[PDB]
Design an enzyme around this catalytic site. Structure first.
Site, short mmCIF file in Angstrom:
data_model
loop_
_atom_site.label_atom_id
_atom_site.label_comp_id
_atom_site.label_asym_id
_atom_site.label_seq_id
_atom_site.Cartn_x
_atom_site.Cartn_y
_atom_site.Cartn_z
N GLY A 1 40.35 10.31 -16.53
CA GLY A 1 39.49 11.32 -16.33
C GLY A 1 39.73 12.58 -17.74
N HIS B 1 32.37 6.13 -25.35
CA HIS B 1 32.67 5.23 -24.27
C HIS B 1 32.06 5.63 -22.86
CE1 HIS B 1 36.14 6.94 -22.63
NE2 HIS B 1 36.81 6.76 -23.78
N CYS C 1 39.55 11.84 -20.96
CA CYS C 1 39.02 11.56 -22.09
C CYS C 1 38.16 12.73 -22.62
CB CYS C 1 38.24 10.27 -22.24
SG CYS C 1 39.36 8.75 -21.88
C1 LIG Z 1 32.95 -0.22 -23.00
S1 LIG Z 1 32.87 -0.80 -21.82
N1 LIG Z 1 33.70 -0.65 -23.87
C2 LIG Z 1 34.53 -1.91 -23.79
C3 LIG Z 1 36.09 -1.12 -23.75
O1 LIG Z 1 36.06 0.23 -23.57
C4 LIG Z 1 37.14 0.93 -24.07
C5 LIG Z 1 38.11 0.43 -24.88
C6 LIG Z 1 39.37 1.02 -25.10
C7 LIG Z 1 39.41 2.57 -24.69
C8 LIG Z 1 38.36 2.88 -24.02
C9 LIG Z 1 37.22 2.37 -23.91
C1 LIG Z 2 39.47 8.51 -20.16
S1 LIG Z 2 38.41 9.36 -18.96
N1 LIG Z 2 39.56 7.08 -19.86
C2 LIG Z 2 39.50 6.52 -18.46
C3 LIG Z 2 39.36 4.97 -18.73
O1 LIG Z 2 38.61 4.73 -19.99
C4 LIG Z 2 37.52 4.10 -20.10
C5 LIG Z 2 36.40 4.46 -20.17
C6 LIG Z 2 34.96 3.56 -20.24
C7 LIG Z 2 35.26 2.16 -20.38
C8 LIG Z 2 36.34 1.73 -20.40
C9 LIG Z 2 37.70 2.54 -20.41
#
Ligand SMILES: *C(=S)NCCOc1ccccc1
Ligand SMILES: *C(=S)NCCOc1ccccc1
Ligand SMILES: *C(=S)NCCOc1ccccc1
Ligand SMILES: *C(=S)NCCOc1ccccc1
Ligand SMILES: *C(=S)NCCOc1ccccc1
Ligand SMILES: *C(=S)NCCOc1ccccc1
Lengths: 305, 305
Positions: free
Chosen positions: B143, B41, B145
């Site tokens: 932050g 992601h 992840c």
């Molecule tokens: C990229 S924008 N993916 C769509 C949603 O992204 C996440 C969904 C759940 C957890 C982390 C990212």
């Molecule tokens: C880990 S750093 N999560 C913060 C938010 O997660 C997302 C990252 C990218 C797209 C959607 C959610």
């Protein structure tokens, strides 16, 4: 989200842990620059074992009686001296992994991480508070003496605790790194015992704020109390008095959640008088007192080292 | 003596943590040999944010779009590929601090340490269990992840978890290091939620044995129960079934304390039916299920790494 008892990353301290042996006694030491620090009881013999004279025991030692191992490397001891209840073994090599460090003595109610070690090798890391009666509730087996407690601030390791012994109730006692015991404990055989303890009120309030920040609100109420009426109830339940300085220290958490400190005190009074009626707070059915206000802020804001 | 939730010393993992940035998105990666692993992601844009196609997003990337920093040193990305829900960034330098390591997938009810990290920098370490519903109850802020979970056996780091997201109940979900999610969770925007959870019975029994080893005996009784009558009560209280394999795994603890597993089961049945009547076990007023039998044995015997 979430709230966990979290220790500091231990790497900077792992690289300082060595094994110290005198005769058949082996324990851990802390290798910083060209000095190894360890509990002085490593020089105990079977001759007295009750009230021995450490100054006599140390005069009878030579440098070569102290075997210091850093991993697989033997370190050459080139001087020895006594520093209160710790020993300072000067070695011929500075530890290349010495972090930035300070020796600080902490107060009752402050927290620190413990790197539990056996034979110079780290086995686990956990968070401890220094109790009001100057003991800590750790996890230490034979062999763990010389393990240290510390906090880390950016890149600086503040060492605050070295482990010396277990008291008869199963709690733990030790020194700062200048070798001075926390509390009225000695490194000789006595019937010494942990004195009466109390609950660290300011930390319980900090933990209630953590609960609110994490969505546990059921114990909140519309009441506020005065500091003196609160402290009357506190005294009754063996809680420490809450000072104005404690209220000030809780300022940032009160601001983030918009719940006044005295407002939260009313909640604590109700919890003390009535219990939880089968509910939990941050996964606990007891009021937790081993998180300082700073511990809450650091975990809710995300500071790193 | 003493029993604490204890994490593994984190140093070996600290030396692998890096920062990965794509556009304005920054998270953590795990730098092993010449590969950096991170959640995929990190390549998300603001264009879809709902159900985007990661294979399309990654085809549109170039190596130079990925900024990887190891402390103050920029690492040069020389290849990129997708591995299920993780990204593999080949870099031009092998990490000189790569420990001996393995990627293992753990089972529900097993525990592991989490090194929580922000911007490639470790902030704290704590113990987690993988819940029966394949979530973990962590402490993670925006932050975090890419933070990892691991166990350590002698000198070998088994990585088992990489953090991807927080579900709406405040619990956490992620993948093994091959990029496969634990549980029925996805890295896209859905209304996904943690399924119903249960208590890990074999761990609760392990923790009662820990309590006995540490001198808490008040809940012991003269009764034994059968495995099926126990499992009838377990089911009623949302506890997982206890198998004969669980009884076998508890063998060493039963032997050390001389209390048969079925004997201890009778104690657990009474605690479930009657509560604790104001008492505590190892400082808890709840039955704790995040310690495996191995966790108890390792902490009561003193194994190191
Ligand atoms: C990229 S924008 N993916 C769509 C949603 O992204 C996440 C969904 C759940 C957890 C982390 C990212
Ligand atoms: C880990 S750093 N999560 C913060 C938010 O997660 C997302 C990252 C990218 C797209 C959607 C959610
Ligand atoms: C050397 S034998 N000193 C006498 C007793 O030694 C200890 C007393 C309490 C804790 C650790 C050592
Ligand atoms: C730490 S390793 N403690 C084990 C036993 O402590 C003693 C050491 C030396 C003399 C007496 C007690
Ligand atoms: C934090 S512990 N600071 C105290 C010492 O700081 C330094 C030590 C060594 C080199 C540079 C700074
Ligand atoms: C434990 S994780 N062992 C798996 C790999 O072991 C080695 C790795 C690198 C060098 C030597 C052994």
């Amino acid at each position: 989200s979430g709230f966990r008892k979290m220790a500091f990353p231990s790497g900077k301290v792992e690289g300082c842990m060595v094994q110290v042996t005198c005769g058949t006694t082996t324990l851990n030491g802390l290798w910083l620059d060209d000095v190894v620090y360890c509990p002085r009881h490593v020089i105990c013999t079977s001759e007295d074992m009750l009230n021995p004279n450490y100054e006599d025991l140390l005069i009878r030692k030579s440098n070569h009686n102290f075997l210091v191992q850093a991993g697989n490397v033997q370190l050459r001891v080139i001087g020895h001296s006594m520093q209160n209840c710790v020993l300072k073994l000067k070695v011929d090599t500075a530890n290349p992994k010495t972090p930035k460090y300070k020796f600080v003595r902490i107060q009752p109610g402050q927290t620190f991480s413990v790197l539990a070690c056996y034979n110079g090798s780290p086995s686990g890391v956990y968070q401890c508070a220094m109790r009001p009666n100057f003991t800590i509730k750790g996890s230490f087996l034979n062999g763990s003496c010389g393990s240290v407690g510390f906090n880390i601030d950016y890149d600086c390791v503040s060492f605050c605790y070295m482990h010396h012994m277990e008291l008869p109730t199963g709690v733990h006692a030790g020194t700062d790194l200048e070798g001075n015991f926390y509390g009225p404990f000695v490194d000789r055989q006595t019937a010494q015992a942990a004195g009466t303890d109390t609950t660290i009120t300011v930390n319980v309030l900090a933990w209630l704020y953590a609960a609110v920040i994490n969505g546990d609100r059921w114990f909140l109420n519309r009441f506020t109390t005065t500091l003196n009426d609160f402290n009357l109830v506190a005294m009754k339940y063996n809680y420490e008095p809450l000072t104005q300085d404690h209220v000030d220290i809780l300022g940032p958490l009160s601001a983030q959640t918009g719940i006044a400190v005295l407002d939260m005190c009313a909640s604590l009074k109700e919890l003390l008088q009535n219990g939880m009626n089968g509910r939990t707070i941050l996964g606990s059915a007891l009021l937790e007192d081993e998180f300082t206000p700073f511990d809450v802020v650091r975990q809710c804001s995300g500071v790193t080292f």
